[PDB]
Design an enzyme around this catalytic site. Structure first.
Site, short mmCIF file in Angstrom:
data_model
loop_
_atom_site.label_atom_id
_atom_site.label_comp_id
_atom_site.label_asym_id
_atom_site.label_seq_id
_atom_site.Cartn_x
_atom_site.Cartn_y
_atom_site.Cartn_z
N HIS A 177 1.10 -1.14 0.06
CA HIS A 177 0.04 -0.10 0.03
C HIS A 177 1.05 1.39 -0.19
O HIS A 177 1.21 1.68 0.90
CB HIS A 177 -0.70 0.16 1.27
CG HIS A 177 -2.13 1.05 1.18
ND1 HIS A 177 -2.09 1.91 0.42
CD2 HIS A 177 -3.09 0.98 1.57
CE1 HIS A 177 -2.89 2.95 0.60
NE2 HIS A 177 -3.80 2.17 1.49
N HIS A 180 -2.70 6.99 -1.26
CA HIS A 180 -3.71 7.57 -0.21
C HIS A 180 -3.24 8.28 0.77
O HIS A 180 -3.92 8.44 1.89
CB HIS A 180 -4.76 6.50 0.06
CG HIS A 180 -5.26 5.97 -0.92
ND1 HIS A 180 -5.77 4.73 -0.98
CD2 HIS A 180 -5.73 6.65 -2.11
CE1 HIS A 180 -6.33 4.44 -2.21
NE2 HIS A 180 -6.44 5.43 -2.81
N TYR A 182 -0.68 7.76 3.07
CA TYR A 182 -0.16 6.69 4.16
C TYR A 182 1.29 6.98 4.22
O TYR A 182 1.88 7.62 3.41
CB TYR A 182 -0.82 5.35 3.94
CG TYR A 182 -2.33 5.70 4.43
CD1 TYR A 182 -2.79 6.08 5.67
CD2 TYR A 182 -3.43 5.04 3.32
CE1 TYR A 182 -4.24 6.25 5.78
CE2 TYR A 182 -4.56 5.07 3.66
CZ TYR A 182 -5.07 5.57 4.70
OH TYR A 182 -6.59 5.93 5.04
N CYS A 299 -8.10 1.49 -10.94
CA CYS A 299 -9.14 1.65 -10.08
C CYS A 299 -9.59 3.11 -9.73
O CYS A 299 -8.74 4.06 -10.12
CB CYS A 299 -8.66 0.91 -8.89
SG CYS A 299 -10.20 0.72 -7.65
#
Ligand SMILES: NC(=O)C1=CN([C@@H]2O[C@H](COP(=O)(O)OP(=O)(O)OC[C@H]3O[C@@H](n4cnc5c(N)ncnc54)[C@H](OP(=O)(O)O)[C@@H]3O)[C@@H](O)[C@H]2O)CCC1
Ligand SMILES: Cc1cc2nc3c(=O)[nH]c(=O)nc-3n(C[C@H](O)[C@H](O)[C@H](O)COP(=O)(O)O)c2cc1C
Length: 365
Positions: A177, A180, A182, A299
């Protein structure tokens, strides 16, 4: 001829269609242990030869930034995941675990000992963003603590261990990940990363951490079991870059070079569509896909029509769906049938009930 519903060889893995379950944080993994609710949730969404990406999964205690999200750093957690993975595999799914560290997007209530969240920087997310707390109120993002270089290597190790643990649980692979806002994005984005050491400044330095992670997990479980997710064009929790096009290409060039060096391809690159809160956006995604040597998952706002079009036009190899998969456990079937899609109830995205708004959206009979 590639269509949304045709087979695909994702390196080591065979898929029967191109519809992917996007990673979705849902907060049903009570006390971070994957449980019977998660088993049913992923089982409901499994199809033969369908690719599933799990919700963000903690690589360490300091990884936490939402309540009741799963981890994969303890034996107890691994045993929980085994049951989820076994059920998905019984349905013929291919399933990757998304490895997640939130960095500064956290709160003292989530941190061991109530310590400050860790980051690239000491700058907090600004007050116009708030964080959901375990008691169903919203709180303020605190000032994070900037990692020392030696400490960054410790987190790389946490990713490595998490990848080993995922394979022990039976996962087909993992997704890093790096999106976004993070932890890894806090290093990549020049709107966040204000470091003056070897991890700050140039694109080379800003991409160093995420590339060290890709290298470590690939060493642990193999390049063909590793996917990477990024989101270069956003502003969520102040995660802006002054040049998203170049940032995305910088990550991609390094992925390409690593693949060439190691002699094999990563499982995929996964990118979410630019969003700040349209045709330049379209072109940006095509530019990134064109530059990356390997499998590309798109996505963000995809519909049945946009998904069909993305695969048919060669814009992507796989198309991930988030919010529609919340309310449509049998989304692949519904897309194949052009059936109506269940509306989703955002009120229960992040609540903790194992049934209500989680596993009780109906499938077609
Ligand atoms: N990586 C992680 O662990 C997760 C990251 N997630 C991402 O963080 C961001 C914020 O998430 P959120 O759930 O707090 O709010 P968001 O999904 O942005 O929705 C806020 C409003 O934007 C609206 N919105 C109008 N376009 C759109 C559109 N393309 N997409 C996501 N909403 C839209 C959306 O409409 P819907 O209720 O989804 O119909 C809603 O009214 C999102 O980019 C999300 O994708 C959320 C939480 C954890
Ligand atoms: C409730 C919710 C949870 C999400 N959790 C994650 C997550 O854990 N990891 C991640 O990379 N993205 C996460 N996302 C972003 C989604 O994977 C996806 O990119 C987003 O929903 C946009 O795609 P869509 O238009 O099909 O919904 C989440 C989104 C939502 C709405």
């Amino acid at each position: 001829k590639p269509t949304l519903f045709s087979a695909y060889k994702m390196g080591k893995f065979n898929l029967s269609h191109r519809v992917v379950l996007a990673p979705l944080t849902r907060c049903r993994a009570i006390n971070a242990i994957p449980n019977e609710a998660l088993v049913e949730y992923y089982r409901q969404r499994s199809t033969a030869g369908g690719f599933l990406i799990t919700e963000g999964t903690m690589i360490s205690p300091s990884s936490a930034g939402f309540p009741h999200v799963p981890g994969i750093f303890t034996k107890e957690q691994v045993e929980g995941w085994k049951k989820v993975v076994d059920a998905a595999h019984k349905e013929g799914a291919v399933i990757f675990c998304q490895l997640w560290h939130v960095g500064r997007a956290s709160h003292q209530v989530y941190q061991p000992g109530g310590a400050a969240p860790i980051s690239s920087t000491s700058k907090p997310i600004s007050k116009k963003w708030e964080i959901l707390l375990p008691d169903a109120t919203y709180g303020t993002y605190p000032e994070p603590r900037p990692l020392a270089a030696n400490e960054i290597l410790e987190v790389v190790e946490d990713y490595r261990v998490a990848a080993i643990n995922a394979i022990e649980a039976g996962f087909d692979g993992i997704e890093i990940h790096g999106a976004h806002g993070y932890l890894l994005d806090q290093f990549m984005k020049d709107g966040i990363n204000d470091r003056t050491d070897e991890y700050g400044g140039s694109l080379e330095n800003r991409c160093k951490f995420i590339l060290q992670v890709v290298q470590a997990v690939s060493a642990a479980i193999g390049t063909d079991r590793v996917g990477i997710r990024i989101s270069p064009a956003i502003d969520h929790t102040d995660a802006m870059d002054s040049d998203p096009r170049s940032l995305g290409l910088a990550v991609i060039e390094r992925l390409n070079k690593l693949q060439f060096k190691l002699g094999s391809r990563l499982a995929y690159l996964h990118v979410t569509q630019p969003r700040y809160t349209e045709e330049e956006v379209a072109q940006l995604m095509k530019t990134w896909r064109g530059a990356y040597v390997g499998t590309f998952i798109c996505c963000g706002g995809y519909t049945r029509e946009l998904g069909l079009q993305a695969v048919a036009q060669g814009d992507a190899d796989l198309v991930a769906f988030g919010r529609y998969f919340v309310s449509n456990p049998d989304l692949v079937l519904r897309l194949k049938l052009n059936a109506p899609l269940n509306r989703y109830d955002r009120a229960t995205f992040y609540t903790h009930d194992p049934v209500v708004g989680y596993t009780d959206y109906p499938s077609l009979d």
